[PDB]
Amino acid sequence: DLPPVAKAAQVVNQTLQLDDSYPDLDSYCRPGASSDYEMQSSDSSWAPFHVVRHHNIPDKVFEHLNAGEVFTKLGLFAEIGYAWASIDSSLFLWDYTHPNPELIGYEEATHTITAVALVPPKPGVFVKTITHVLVVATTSEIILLGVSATPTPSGSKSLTLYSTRMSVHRGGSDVSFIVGTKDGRIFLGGESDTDIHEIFYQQEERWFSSRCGKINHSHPFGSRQQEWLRGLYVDDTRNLLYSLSNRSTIRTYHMEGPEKLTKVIEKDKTSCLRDFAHMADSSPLFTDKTNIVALSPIPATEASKLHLMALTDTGCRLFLSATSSASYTALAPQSMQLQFVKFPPRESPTRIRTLSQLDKTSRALDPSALGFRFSPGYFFDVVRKHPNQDMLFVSAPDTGRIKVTQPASALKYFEQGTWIELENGNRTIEIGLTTAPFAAAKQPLGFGNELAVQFDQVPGEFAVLTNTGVHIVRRRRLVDIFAKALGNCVSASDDALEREVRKFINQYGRVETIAAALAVACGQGSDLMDRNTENLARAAFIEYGGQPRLASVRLSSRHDALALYLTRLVRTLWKAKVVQVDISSTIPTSKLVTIQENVERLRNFLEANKSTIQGLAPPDIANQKEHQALHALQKLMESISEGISFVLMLFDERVSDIYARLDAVSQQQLKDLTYEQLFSQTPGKELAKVLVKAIVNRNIASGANVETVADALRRRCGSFCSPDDVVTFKAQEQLQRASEQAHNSPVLRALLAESLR
Amino acid sequence: LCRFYTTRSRFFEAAQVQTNLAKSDLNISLKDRIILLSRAKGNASVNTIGISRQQQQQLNHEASELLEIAHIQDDLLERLVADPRIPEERKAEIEEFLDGPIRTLTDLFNDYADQANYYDLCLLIFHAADFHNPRTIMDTWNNLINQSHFEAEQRREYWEIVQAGGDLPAGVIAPIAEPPLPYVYVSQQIQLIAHRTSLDSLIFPVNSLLPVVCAYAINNGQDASIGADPCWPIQLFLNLGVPHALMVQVLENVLDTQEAPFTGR
């Protein structure tokens, strides 16, 4: 009743939903506390992060820095691969990825620079080529500079600066912190007080208003005690702004409008401590003596309730919720509460490899000087136990264990952790993300599924700026760990692999482990011996893939692994529309190529092992449905490749031209055509047969080459093209070209006679 | 090891060890990498028995190129660290990425030399890279001349204030002696570079550079009014070793085309 590709498409749809059901942060950080860690040595194949390279500060910057009379400062523009150094009233930028960078100097400023930041521009203000705004704060004024960070052939942005005539006098309040919103709003704070200022700017000059203005959103008055800021933090997904004070007070501001900022929550350390005391587990790691050293916003895409992480100097991660009084009038919260605490790990870093209650007393992260959190929970903590050497604790969610945990009430904040040692003299200054923000889904459920996106986005990389250079730290995926572990099993026994494989099964489950083996066998992780590793991965896929069984059947873990891998290769495509109507393609062509290559390498792997992999060759009811299921998946793979080739062919022509000369029903069918329908549903095939029948018609009008477009459609997308149609196309070729040559007398009798043949 | 080789007249083997070490990712400072390369260069320039002239020259050449780039990198690092207008925060960062393995000329230009407006070093970089781009080269020459002029002007001003009783801006080391006129400091910059690149470079296209310097002299009154020799631009390039025929040849072109300031009287 239901054909192969439609059966396999059913497996894909159910697999997509399974990946998108990965637990949300609120669900495994429920009210309470946790100390769950599995620590890994930094040199281990199981390390969750590792240093990939380092970039020294240019010598010319050292010359300027040691030529500093009063004040110097370093900072990071990790979004574009740039660092900067300020010396008194002078500023120097440079691309730290470049092996011998040139210094972009800016010395117009008259007074000492106290803060520098790179923010988005205000829309409709600057030319489109301006990608950022550079904010330079001195003791006398704030200065805006236009920035164009266009990528270069080498892979590092080319940076050019533009003047703006936009500037404002600072005033009496120091500026040490500058943050920007998605829409280009610029907020300021510093070490004089807790006031928050905003800089406005516009293109037009007016007689009643300048191009650039500044206002104090705090409206202070009367008696005020000493208190100032330690940092500012933005969350665009909630239109919120957070400040942290030197007294560890957390203030929340809501952007109720494009020019408004309203304080809506103020929570001092006493309030946090009172919440903490009402929890079941109180600890001497958090008292009235403890300081909060850093905040990190948690976006609404990641979690609904938990808004904010706060790091104590004892290494405790405080996770705070925020809630509005009502459900309708963005809606501003009015309350904030400490709900969940992740306590520090216990293992300390060691040169030599050392050998179930809540651990709420560890001093391993005491003192924590700096801290950072990146979605889906990557945590960097600068521990400063000694005044000369920083130690870096880095941890990630144990995505594999969180995904397998059952039932939901057993979910805990499991983590994989490691210690990265920096050499003597390295003082960490800042840590920033160099790759695109992580997101496996568009809502909390599914958001943190690292496993699902292993092959859709590069692993996260982080630039660690020190006083001596920039270190690049990279997140390691399961396939990276699996490949590395197998690389150590190349010189060992049959039982050595089985032992290493059992470690993975106990953490990730059998399906995820076999899917990793399949991926490694197909060359994933090799963008980083390699033939032996891929052959070991093949051996693991065969030997430990399981088998089908009667419970309706339960297919092998080998089958589920193939379905899981294939689904994740096309997850960005499946439910997406093919086109966007001036019609264009929803998915960039470059992305369609890589997806197709991945699908084809998977197909090539199955063909080269059709004889050794169970279920591929034909075989009692169990192995029967195993063969049918595997067959259906392989038919979907070839259909996926044909479908992608068809879309690429389509946009190589002039689709808008083809779309114009088309009937309404077929325009509408093409309007809401998804990749799933193209791959697995007859209407996509029928519509594909219409489009090919239409593109060739147009190709003949351009008349570049018919027989080349023929052999293009004949072979690659065969089984969807028909050989009786190309001969027809060859006939309509001479017919139209007989109408092209129509004025000629002797040339047609050969065109029309051959068209008739 | 290298000391053993050399005393045994095995200079090429030592040059090989030293070069590889200079290119390696071991923890070696830039200055030590400069010493290693400089030694390899010497050791590869002399005969080592049993080894072909071709193999010697190729190593001596790789060491010479890497040594040239290394010296550039060292000039940068030093200048940046000492630069009063660079924030301390940045300097530490510069020292980390420049006081280690030798970087590519692209990086040195883009991330450091161009950002800090060290145009003289930019020019040395265009030389080491065989950079074929007359327009950019001249743009850099124009920036170097103007930058140097403004700096000389500033220093003469400070001096004039000392000799009049006034006070200099906070944190300005006075000049106890008449600093050089701007055209003297500019030509100093041109000499330093010339000696470093040897006039045979593409950063000394006399047909473009001589008119620009002459242009500068006119448009900034670097002439008799201030007690300078009106022919100073010509003296400069002649002593520098530009052949007489080429000079006159260019000057002819200047006179025939009547461009920029070379017009009217």
Partner: peptide, 14 residues
């Protein structure tokens, strides 16, 4: 080398 600051005219439209 002091960075060349291109003019406001290019920067802001229209």
């Amino acid at each position: 080398r002091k960075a060349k600051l291109l003019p406001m005219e290019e920067a802001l439209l229209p």
